[PDB]
């Protein structure tokens, strides 16, 4: 009974992390940080086509998957870090060729390889250097003329949102895969729910809303 | 021809609720915060809260803190306010700014039996 | 919060001479200072805002300027049409503050 439940999340996990795959590769998605979102598209829709169904070279990708979201999630809060701290534009200085590069060393340094050198060292860095960055971007935030936005006549309020959406999708991943590295089989299946937040947190948040209804045929707020 | 359109007139009873909205056109909506401001009869004014269209965040003041709900609609380019509870003491105009900027037609609330 | 008061309360003038009303803050604004005009039966129009500069479609005949602590709103050679309530806000910091508003008239 319960078996044939978890049947209908495993679906969510090769639909919900395809409809962000295939999004990425429109012309206004195409940035490095969504080119960072959908690394994590395909270390979570690989763990739903052949770590899930199987558990519900099979345990070697079931770390390869996980030592890689972990790992990407520590890329994305300092190359948000960059950007911020960054002189110019609310844009970081990666390139689009050397995001690809960096990208899949990622993979390969992930399957070249543990709770400490896959887990605590990308975690420990991962949140201190976006704290770093949600500070940052609170003295910026307000930095701003006060005039400006209620009589008009860059780092802002929905650029403000960005950190938010990407603040949770790295305060998730933690709370899911915690308690795991800290029923046994529990955690391990607390870690396979971080798998159906990605597409989920990306809808209320950020830009990806219409991206998804696009992606489904005008589907219902047309 | 910037404007934000407003009721005028809203009647409801003591207890009640009322949701005043706010028809913005003449602009980009999501330019500009929209304010919430209080007027009592022949009295000054009280900001309620500061809600920007664009983003979210919503500021309220910690009078009207678990009394109003600012709510703006992107597409309809309308902004909402949620005012729950009713009193007697509620009855006033209740103006729409587009940040103290352009002030609104205003609605005259009045809460009574 | 942040009290503002806003002299004088009351004020009758004549055509042709300045007027000029005062509005301090008890604390520092960042020259995030505004001035508005309700008159009997309207919707506020507002004249000032950032200390001194005019919203447009404002009579260049509004001159604002003050400080931090204090400022005040100035109008050389008031016009028959200048008579209503004053009202100077804060937007520095929550909650938004306005002043009481002083009410201008004029001697006929």
């Known amino acids: 009974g319960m078996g044939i439940v978890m049947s209908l999340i495993v679906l969510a996990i090769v639909f919900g992390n395809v409809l962000v795959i295939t999004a990425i590769a429109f012309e206004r998605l195409q940035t490095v940080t969504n080119y960072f979102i959908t690394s994590l598209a395909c270390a979570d829709l690989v763990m739903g086509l052949a770590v899930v169904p199987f558990g519900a070279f099979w345990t070697s990708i079931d770390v390869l998957c996980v030592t890689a979201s972990i790992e990407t999630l520590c890329v994305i809060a300092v190359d948000r870090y960059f950007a911020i701290t960054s002189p110019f534009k609310y844009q970081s200085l990666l390139t689009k060729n050397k995001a690809r590069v960096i990208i899949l060393m990622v993979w390969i340094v992930s399957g070249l390889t543990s709770s400490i050198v896959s887990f605590y060292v990308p975690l420990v860095i991962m949140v201190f250097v976006y704290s770093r960055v949600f500070q940052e971007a609170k003295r910026q935030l307000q930095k701003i003329d006060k005039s400006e936005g209620r009589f008009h006549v860059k780092f802002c309020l929905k650029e403000h949102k960005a950190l938010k959406t990407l603040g949770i999708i790295m305060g998730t991943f933690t709370l899911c895969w915690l308690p795991f590295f800290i029923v046994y089989i529990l955690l391990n299946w607390i870690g396979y729910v971080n798998s159906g937040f990605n597409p989920l947190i990306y809808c209320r948040s950020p830009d990806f809303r219409i991206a998804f209804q696009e992606l489904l045929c005008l589907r219902r707020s047309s | 021809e910037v404007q934000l359109q407003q009721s005028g007139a809203e009647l409801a009873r003591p207890g009640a609720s009322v949701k005043l909205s706010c028809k913005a056109s003449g602009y980009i909506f999501t330019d500009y915060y929209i304010n919430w401001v209080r007027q009592r009869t022949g009295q000054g004014f009280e900001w309620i809260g500061e809600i920007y269209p664009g983003s979210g965040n919503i500021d309220y003041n910690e009078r009207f803190k678990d009394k109003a709900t600012l709510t703006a609609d992107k597409s309809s380019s309308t902004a909402y306010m949620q005012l729950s509870s009713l009193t007697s003491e509620d009855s006033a105009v209740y103006f729409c700014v587009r940040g103290f900027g352009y002030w609104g037609q205003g609605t005259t609330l009045t809460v009574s039996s | 919060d942040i009290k503002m008061t806003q002299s004088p309360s009351s004020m009758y003038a004549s055509l042709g001479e300045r007027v000029t009303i005062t509005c301090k803050a008890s604390?520092?604004?960042?020259?995030?200072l505004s001035w508005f005009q309700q008159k009997p039966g309207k919707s506020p129009k507002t004249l000032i805002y950032r200390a001194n500069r005019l919203v447009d479609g404002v009579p260049s005949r509004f001159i604002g300027t003050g400080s931090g602590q204090d400022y005040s709103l100035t109008i050389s050679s008031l016009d028959y049409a200048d008579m209503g309530i004053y009202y100077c806000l804060q937007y520095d910091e929550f909650p938004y503050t306005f002043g009481g508003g002083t009410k201008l008239e004029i001697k006929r």
């Open positions: 604390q520092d604004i960042n020259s995030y």
